[PDB]
Design a protein around this motif. Sequence first.
Motif, PDB file in Angstrom:
ATOM      1  N   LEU A 154      36.671  42.390  30.291  1.00 49.63           N
ATOM      2  CA  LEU A 154      36.982  41.052  29.815  1.00 49.63           C
ATOM      3  C   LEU A 154      35.857  40.543  28.952  1.00 49.63           C
ATOM      4  O   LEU A 154      34.698  40.548  29.382  1.00 49.63           O
ATOM      5  N   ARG A 155      36.205  40.072  27.749  1.00 45.60           N
ATOM      6  CA  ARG A 155      35.255  39.435  26.859  1.00 45.60           C
ATOM      7  C   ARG A 155      35.397  37.931  27.021  1.00 45.60           C
ATOM      8  O   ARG A 155      36.460  37.395  26.831  1.00 45.60           O
ATOM      9  N   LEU A 156      34.294  37.268  27.335  1.00 44.09           N
ATOM     10  CA  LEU A 156      34.274  35.822  27.447  1.00 44.09           C
ATOM     11  C   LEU A 156      34.188  35.198  26.048  1.00 44.09           C
ATOM     12  O   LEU A 156      33.577  35.718  25.143  1.00 44.09           O
ATOM     13  N   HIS A 157      34.743  34.013  25.924  1.00 44.59           N
ATOM     14  CA  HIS A 157      34.757  33.321  24.641  1.00 44.59           C
ATOM     15  C   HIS A 157      33.383  32.848  24.199  1.00 44.59           C
ATOM     16  O   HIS A 157      33.092  32.778  23.004  1.00 44.59           O
ATOM     17  N   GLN A 158      32.545  32.526  25.160  1.00 42.74           N
ATOM     18  CA  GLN A 158      31.195  32.102  24.882  1.00 42.74           C
ATOM     19  C   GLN A 158      30.344  32.728  25.983  1.00 42.74           C
ATOM     20  O   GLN A 158      30.766  32.764  27.132  1.00 42.74           O
ATOM     21  N   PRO A 159      29.119  33.170  25.639  1.00 44.50           N
ATOM     22  CA  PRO A 159      28.277  33.696  26.721  1.00 44.50           C
ATOM     23  C   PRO A 159      27.953  32.700  27.825  1.00 44.50           C
ATOM     24  O   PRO A 159      27.929  31.502  27.572  1.00 44.50           O
ATOM     25  N   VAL A 160      27.772  33.217  29.036  1.00 37.61           N
ATOM     26  CA  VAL A 160      27.179  32.420  30.120  1.00 37.61           C
ATOM     27  C   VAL A 160      25.662  32.394  29.953  1.00 37.61           C
ATOM     28  O   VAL A 160      25.091  33.185  29.215  1.00 37.61           O
ATOM     29  N   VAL A 161      25.031  31.462  30.642  1.00 37.99           N
ATOM     30  CA  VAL A 161      23.575  31.342  30.759  1.00 37.99           C
ATOM     31  C   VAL A 161      23.157  32.030  32.051  1.00 37.99           C
ATOM     32  O   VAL A 161      23.649  31.667  33.126  1.00 37.99           O
ATOM     33  N   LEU A 162      22.282  33.040  31.989  1.00 37.26           N
ATOM     34  CA  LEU A 162      21.750  33.614  33.211  1.00 37.26           C
ATOM     35  C   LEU A 162      20.827  32.622  33.900  1.00 37.26           C
ATOM     36  O   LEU A 162      19.974  31.976  33.255  1.00 37.26           O
ATOM     37  N   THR A 163      21.014  32.539  35.201  1.00 36.12           N
ATOM     38  CA  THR A 163      20.295  31.565  36.013  1.00 36.12           C
ATOM     39  C   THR A 163      20.045  32.227  37.395  1.00 36.12           C
ATOM     40  O   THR A 163      20.525  33.351  37.640  1.00 36.12           O
ATOM     41  N   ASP A 164      19.392  31.521  38.319  1.00 36.05           N
ATOM     42  CA  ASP A 164      19.288  32.059  39.696  1.00 36.05           C
ATOM     43  C   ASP A 164      20.628  32.331  40.361  1.00 36.05           C
ATOM     44  O   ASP A 164      20.735  33.108  41.284  1.00 36.05           O
ATOM     45  N   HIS A 165      21.663  31.673  39.863  1.00 37.29           N
ATOM     46  CA  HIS A 165      23.021  31.791  40.400  1.00 37.29           C
ATOM     47  C   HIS A 165      23.981  32.649  39.615  1.00 37.29           C
ATOM     48  O   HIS A 165      25.090  32.861  40.057  1.00 37.29           O
ATOM     49  N   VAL A 166      23.553  33.126  38.452  1.00 40.40           N
ATOM     50  CA  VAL A 166      24.415  33.885  37.551  1.00 40.40           C
ATOM     51  C   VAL A 166      23.566  35.015  36.987  1.00 40.40           C
ATOM     52  O   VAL A 166      22.688  34.815  36.149  1.00 40.40           O
ATOM     53  N   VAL A 167      23.846  36.241  37.446  1.00 36.73           N
ATOM     54  CA  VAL A 167      23.049  37.394  37.075  1.00 36.73           C
ATOM     55  C   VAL A 167      23.999  38.593  37.010  1.00 36.73           C
ATOM     56  O   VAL A 167      24.879  38.739  37.861  1.00 36.73           O
ATOM     57  N   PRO A 168      23.815  39.447  35.996  1.00 37.18           N
ATOM     58  CA  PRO A 168      24.720  40.600  35.914  1.00 37.18           C
ATOM     59  C   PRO A 168      24.362  41.680  36.914  1.00 37.18           C
ATOM     60  O   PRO A 168      23.201  41.860  37.271  1.00 37.18           O
ATOM     61  N   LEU A 169      25.383  42.453  37.279  1.00 31.96           N
ATOM     62  CA  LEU A 169      25.193  43.657  38.094  1.00 31.96           C
ATOM     63  C   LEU A 169      24.983  44.820  37.132  1.00 31.96           C
ATOM     64  O   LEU A 169      25.668  44.900  36.119  1.00 31.96           O
ATOM     65  N   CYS A 170      24.060  45.753  37.464  1.00 32.66           N
ATOM     66  CA  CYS A 170      23.777  46.859  36.566  1.00 32.66           C
ATOM     67  C   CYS A 170      24.935  47.862  36.507  1.00 32.66           C
ATOM     68  O   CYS A 170      25.472  48.257  37.547  1.00 32.66           O
ATOM     69  N   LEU A 171      25.365  48.229  35.305  1.00 33.87           N
ATOM     70  CA  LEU A 171      26.343  49.273  35.117  1.00 33.87           C
ATOM     71  C   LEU A 171      25.557  50.594  35.038  1.00 33.87           C
ATOM     72  O   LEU A 171      24.815  50.829  34.086  1.00 33.87           O
ATOM     73  N   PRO A 172      25.609  51.429  36.098  1.00 32.26           N
ATOM     74  CA  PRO A 172      24.740  52.613  36.170  1.00 32.26           C
ATOM     75  C   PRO A 172      25.143  53.736  35.219  1.00 32.26           C
ATOM     76  O   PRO A 172      26.286  53.821  34.820  1.00 32.26           O
ATOM     77  N   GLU A 173      24.211  54.613  34.879  1.00 32.05           N
ATOM     78  CA  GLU A 173      24.556  55.868  34.243  1.00 32.05           C
ATOM     79  C   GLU A 173      25.482  56.643  35.176  1.00 32.05           C
ATOM     80  O   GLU A 173      25.344  56.627  36.411  1.00 32.05           O
ATOM     81  N   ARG A 174      26.383  57.383  34.570  1.00 34.25           N
ATOM     82  CA  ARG A 174      27.326  58.154  35.322  1.00 34.25           C
ATOM     83  C   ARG A 174      26.663  59.188  36.222  1.00 34.25           C
ATOM     84  O   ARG A 174      27.078  59.295  37.387  1.00 34.25           O
TER      85      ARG A 174
END
Lengths: 210, 249, 143
Positions: free
Chosen positions: B94-114
């Motif tokens: 899913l592509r979001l229309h506008q980026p989110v702001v990373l914060t203490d409450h919003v952080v991405p999960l790492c997409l690992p190497e296969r």
Amino acid sequence: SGTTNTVAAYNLTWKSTNFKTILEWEPKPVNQVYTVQISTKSGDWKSKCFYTTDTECDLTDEIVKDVKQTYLARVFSYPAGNVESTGSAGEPLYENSPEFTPYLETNLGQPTIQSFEQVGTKVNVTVEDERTLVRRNNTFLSLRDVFGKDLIYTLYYWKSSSSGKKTAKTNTNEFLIDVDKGENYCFSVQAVIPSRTVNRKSTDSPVECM
Amino acid sequence: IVGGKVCPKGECPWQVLLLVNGAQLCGGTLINTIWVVSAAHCFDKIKNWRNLIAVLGEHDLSEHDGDEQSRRVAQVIIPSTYVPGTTNHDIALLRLHQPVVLTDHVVPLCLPERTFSERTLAFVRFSLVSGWGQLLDRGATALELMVLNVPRLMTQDCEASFPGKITEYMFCAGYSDGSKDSCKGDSGGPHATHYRGTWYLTGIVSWGQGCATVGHFGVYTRVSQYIEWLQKLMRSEPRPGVLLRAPFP
Amino acid sequence: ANAFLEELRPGSLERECKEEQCSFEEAREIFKDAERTKLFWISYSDGDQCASSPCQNGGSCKDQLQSYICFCLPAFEGRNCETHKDDQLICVNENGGCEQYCSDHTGTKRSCRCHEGYSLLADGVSCTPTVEYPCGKIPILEK
Ligand SMILES: *C[C@@](*)(O)[C@H](CCCNC(N)=[NH2+])NC(=O)[C@H](Cc1ccccc1)NC(=O)[C@@H](Cc1ccccc1)NC(C)=O
Ligand SMILES: *[C@@H]1O[C@H](CO)[C@@H](O)[C@H](O[C@H]2OC[C@@H](O)[C@H](O[C@H]3OC[C@@H](O)[C@H](O)[C@H]3O)[C@H]2O)[C@H]1O
Ligand SMILES: *[C@@H]1O[C@@H](C)[C@@H](O)[C@@H](O)[C@@H]1O
Ligand SMILES: C[N+](C)(C)C
Ligand SMILES: C[N+](C)(C)C
Ligand SMILES: C[N+](C)(C)C
Ligand SMILES: C[N+](C)(C)C
Ligand SMILES: C[N+](C)(C)C
Ligand SMILES: C[N+](C)(C)C
Ligand SMILES: C[N+](C)(C)C
Ligand SMILES: C[N+](C)(C)C
Ligand SMILES: C[N+](C)(C)C
Ligand SMILES: C[N+](C)(C)C
Ligand SMILES: C[N+](C)(C)C
Ligand SMILES: C[N+](C)(C)C
Ligand SMILES: C[N+](C)(C)C
Ligand SMILES: C[N+](C)(C)C
Ligand SMILES: C[N+](C)(C)C
Ligand SMILES: C[N+](C)(C)C
Ligand SMILES: C[N+](C)(C)C
Ligand SMILES: C[N+](C)(C)C
Ligand SMILES: C[N+](C)(C)C
Ligand SMILES: C[N+](C)(C)C
Ligand SMILES: C[N+](C)(C)C
Ligand SMILES: C[N+](C)(C)C
Ligand SMILES: [Ca+2]
Ligand SMILES: [Ca+2]
Ligand SMILES: [Ca+2]
Ligand SMILES: [Ca+2]
Ligand SMILES: [Ca+2]
Ligand SMILES: [Ca+2]
Ligand SMILES: [Ca+2]
Ligand SMILES: [Ca+2]
Ligand SMILES: [Ca+2]
């Protein structure tokens, strides 16, 4: 079966004495090699014995980390000379071992009578408190260190001049027995963990005689 | 989530909530400021694409506390091999229309190497699964984000539960003793695996037989099969359309 | 063992089986009873399976019945202490000791690498963030 790339291991067997613990299996490597994993029932899987032609894997150093845990092992097969070819899911063929709980299941090794000492009608008989594969810090623990009060010894002894065997039991590694003067006695011992349901006893020690 | 507990606020900071026309649809996983991974099946019944919203930083659905960030979903990308109503290839980007702001409450999960994911992450026994889905099979959904630790199975060990149904694009995790599982409404949420201090995406909540059914495990999309697919799409020149099918592999 | 005229003497476990090798019948001349002789014999005749020095790499051998056990030094494992623990540095072995990513290479040591938003430390295995909110960390707990 010319079309087969690997076959699963089978007859996975735990061989364990005094905590020296080796998993064994079939078949002999036929166009394939093996890797073993071991875990505690709720722990992470650790790989051992990587891409080996052996049909055995020493797991002692893993199981002695906590001899009271229950361990699971599995044996993976890989195509020889092409060991990264494990299918698109990245899961080679494998087989699961029986569960193994070392404290309960490791065989007691054959004991040794260290010494005996007679004064008149009394004799001390001492069993060697031998080492196991369990380490603590930089040292191997003895059988008594590991089992404590769970370990006993049984003595079978006899007068050469009469039929009939006598027995005694000890909570330590030592017996103090009464003997008739002027008679030469012989002795053998077994290690026993009375609380076990299986593998409760060692084989008999060598026989030692006055 | 069945048999879980509340994920304390900020401790599942990659969790996404998907809404359609303001109603709860599915979960998702944040993997960078404009990209969310979810399950393709979350979109099988949609007709109101204009009102699809992703919420980051969400915790308690009954109150806006200020850490929530809401975004229209600009595009949903699904594998060309996905067939609505069928379990295989259950993944969407899913592509979001506008980026989110990373914060203490919003952080991405790492997409690992296969290779790391197959050689190493796959052998970490327990992983976390989370969501606002049903608390019991056929029960009510959760108001506060729930999380559960589930143990993973190699497919040979799950085969008997789902004979001939677990493909190479899936894996099983859970308890066959029935205590604990993900459930309906949790789809799209992360199966997140810890290794040496960092968390990585290893699965997407996908399907099961009921929830916490004895003899059965939850079935998760095997993300390792999709790492290249996802990476290529995130690099690609956008194409028009709200729903896009992208070639797989 | 038997030398001419020795067998006119009473049997002696020390003289005949400890100072010399004795046969089963020599041992039986000592113990008299079949079952007692058997119990002695099963150990006495077993042999020292350590005599072949099966324990490698400074390990110590302990004889058993029809078997042995090898006690290894800390850096080794195996039935015969043949496996060096520090010497299978490949990515499938605990991730090559890498914190994040691991690559095996032809003709070099494995290398460790880090995910975007991290960098590899001097130790060659650990990763540290290079951004404020790197992936896969829980900032609310690392505060
Ligand atoms: C969409 C998700 O919210 C949800 C998650 C369920 C996880 N269950 C568990 N026990 N861990 N998934 C579904 O409800 C799923 C939907 C679906 C998935 C993939 C493709 C198409 C649809 N359905 C089921 O889980 C369902 C089994 C099923 C799956 C596909 C097609 C038909 C039926 N199980 C049910 C209903 O019990
Ligand atoms: C003499 O050294 C050679 C190696 O050079 C060993 O192969 C010999 O040991 C083999 O033969 C004697 C067996 O008793 C032994 O197997 C038993 O003991 C070791 C255990 O680990 C095993 O389970 C058991 O069967 C075998 O390895 C050695 O005497
Ligand atoms: C026997 O035990 C092993 C571990 C080594 O310490 C040897 O030196 C010793 O003789
Ligand atoms: C081989 N088995 C006896 C352990 C089953
Ligand atoms: C051979 N042993 C595993 C029993 C020690
Ligand atoms: C990991 N397990 C104990 C649930 C099987
Ligand atoms: C695999 N090998 C260590 C037995 C050679
Ligand atoms: C293989 N087993 C663990 C089921 C016994
Ligand atoms: C001789 N000792 C065994 C009693 C120490
Ligand atoms: C388990 N125990 C050794 C403490 C008796
Ligand atoms: C009689 N026993 C010594 C063989 C136990
Ligand atoms: C020393 N002990 C044999 C009396 C116990
Ligand atoms: C029979 N023996 C006591 C002399 C050994
Ligand atoms: C919209 N609200 C339910 C958060 C109040
Ligand atoms: C709707 N809101 C949560 C974004 C404020
Ligand atoms: C929800 N939004 C359209 C205001 C971004
Ligand atoms: C149609 N299908 C769900 C049976 C695959
Ligand atoms: C469609 N199903 C067989 C997976 C339930
Ligand atoms: C040991 N294994 C990673 C190859 C499964
Ligand atoms: C939470 N855990 C006990 C399953 C590890
Ligand atoms: C095939 N299996 C016995 C490993 C489950
Ligand atoms: C034993 N069972 C509850 C898994 C059926
Ligand atoms: C299960 N874990 C949280 C310890 C990684
Ligand atoms: C005659 N004797 C050898 C038995 C003593
Ligand atoms: C050393 N021994 C137990 C084999 C007698
Ligand atoms: Ca809220
Ligand atoms: Ca002689
Ligand atoms: Ca003689
Ligand atoms: Ca004689
Ligand atoms: Ca002599
Ligand atoms: Ca002498
Ligand atoms: Ca004779
Ligand atoms: Ca004779
Ligand atoms: Ca021997």
